[PDB]
Amino acid sequence: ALRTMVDPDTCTSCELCYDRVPEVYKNRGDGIAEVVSPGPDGWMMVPPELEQEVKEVTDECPSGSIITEEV
Numbered sequence: 820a821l822r823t824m825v826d827p828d829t830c831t832s833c834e835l836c837y838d839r840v841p842e843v844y845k846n847r848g849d850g851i852a853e854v855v856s857p858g859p860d861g862w863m864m865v866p867p868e869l870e871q872e873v874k875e876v877t878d879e880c881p882s883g884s885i886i887t888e889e890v
């Protein structure tokens with residue numbers, strides 16, 4: 820399965836991730852991206868139909884702020 824998070828420390832608020840994949844990411848309020856549904860650790864499990872989309876924005880994020888991994 821796939822899980823993803825956003826590092827707010829490095830996000831440049833380019834709006835790419837939560838414009839492309841609103842199912843996974845959202846504008847936290849001030850332009851910084853955040854997963855729509857994080858756990859205590861901050862990770863969000865990605866629905867299988869959204870895996871390829873999540874992997875794409877992970878590579879496309881200009882600031883390397885999106886962290887994604889297989890679990």
Ligand code: SF4
Nearest residue numbers: 830831833834836880
């Ligand atoms: S794509 Fe990266 S830099 Fe752009 S809003 Fe999302 S996390 Fe921030």
